[PDB]
């Protein structure tokens, strides 16, 4: 069994200055390797924590984490409007890298992705991810599906250097991952499509950190018709 995070809760409001402390715990030590991402109201996703308590630059110094072996949390010590949206924490010890359920936080009383498909059921796509930064061939182009609802899933990844992929078991038959350095684009293909593959589809890239995914794509909508 790949390792199964929890977030105890899923929901939660709270008022303008409030401390919120938002717990995920998993199936097993994972050696500090957690990281914890934010999605605004817009499904846009960016890596706020990475290593557990490391803050990525720019982050709100009123943000922090803690934790080991199999207890982590999240800690804002002073809500905020901005920090309005849902919190997925993730683990990077072993793969596939699996995440929470999601907390939605609320107030009390480079990565260029294509367009949104509709495709009859059945179908197959292949949606692209275009990065202008410079590291694209040197790094790892991650994807992550998201059904309304559920915490995100990594679905696998691939090295734009030489093509080498990485799956996650649950997907390998579902997608195929490629890429093409002269336009610096990774493309994900999804065949054989069913209504529980409708969803928003995310690009992620990761490199100084394999498992902490800090650049992301805005997203691909993909709706298999009734």
């Known amino acids: 069994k790949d390792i199964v995070l929890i977030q105890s809760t899923s929901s939660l409001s709270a008022s303008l200055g409030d401390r919120v402390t938002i717990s995920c715990r998993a199936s097993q030590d994972i050696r500090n390797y957690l990281n914890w991402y934010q999605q605004k109201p817009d499904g846009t996703v960016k890596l706020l924590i990475y290593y557990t308590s490391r803050l990525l630059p720019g982050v709100p110094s009123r943000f922090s984490g803690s934790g080991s072996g199999t207890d982590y949390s999240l800690t804002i010590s002073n809500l905020e409007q901005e920090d309005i949206g849902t919190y997925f924490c993730?683990?990077?010890?072993?793969?596939?890298?699996?995440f929470g359920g999601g907390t939605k936080l609320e107030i009390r009383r480079q990565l260029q992705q294509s367009g949104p498909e509709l495709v009859k059921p059945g179908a197959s796509v292949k949606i692209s991810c275009k990065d202008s930064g410079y590291a694209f061939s040197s790094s790892w182009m991650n994807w992550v599906k998201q059904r309304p609802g559920q915490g995100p899933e990594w679905i696998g990844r691939?090295?734009?250097?030489?093509?080498?992929?990485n799956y996650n078991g649950k997907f390998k038959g579902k997608a195929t991952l490629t890429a093409d350095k002269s336009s610096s684009t990774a493309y994900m293909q999804l065949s054989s499509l069913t209504s529980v593959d409708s969803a928003v589809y995310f690009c992620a890239r990761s490199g100084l950190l394999r498992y902490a995914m800090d650049y992301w794509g805005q997203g691909t909508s993909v709706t298999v018709s009734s």
């Open positions: 993730q683990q990077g010890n072993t793969l596939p890298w699996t």
């Open positions: 691939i090295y734009p250097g030489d093509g080498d992929t």
